[PDB]
Amino acid sequence: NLPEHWTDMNHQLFCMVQLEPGQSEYNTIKDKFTRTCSSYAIEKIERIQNAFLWQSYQVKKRQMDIKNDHKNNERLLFHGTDADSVPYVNQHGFNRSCAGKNAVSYGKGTYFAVDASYSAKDTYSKPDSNGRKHMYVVRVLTGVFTKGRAGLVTPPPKNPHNPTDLFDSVTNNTRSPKLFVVFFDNQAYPEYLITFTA
Q: Rounded to the nearest whole angstrom, what is the least distance from the CB of residue 114 to ligand 89Q in the complex?
A: 9
Choose which of 9, 35, 38, 163 interacts with a copy of itself (CB under 8 A).
163
Residue 94 interacts with ligand 89Q (CB under 6 A): yes or no: no
Residue 103: CB atoms within 10 A of its CB come to 8
Q: Could you say whether residue 176 binds ligand 89Q (CB under 6 A)? A: no
In sign, the C-alpha dihedral spanning 46, 47, 53, 59 is positive
Instruction: Answer yes or no whether residue 150 interacts with a copy of itself by CB under 8 A.
Output: no
Cα atoms in the Cβ-side hemisphere of radius 13 Å centred on 7:
12
- Cα(141)–Cα(57) distance, rounded to whole angstroms? 9
**Residue 171's binding partner, choosing from a copy of itself, ligand 89Q, none, with beta-carbon cut-off 5 to 8 A by kind?**
none
Q: Would you report the helix, strand and coil content of the chain in percent, each value rounded to 5? A: 25, 30, 45
Candidate ranges 36-44, 51-59, 129-137, 174-182; the one touching a copy of itself (CB under 8 A):
51-59
Contact positions vs a copy of itself (CB under 8 A): 13, 52, 55-56, 59-60, 63, 66-67, 87-88, 90-92, 95-98, 108, 153-154, 163-164, 166, 183-186
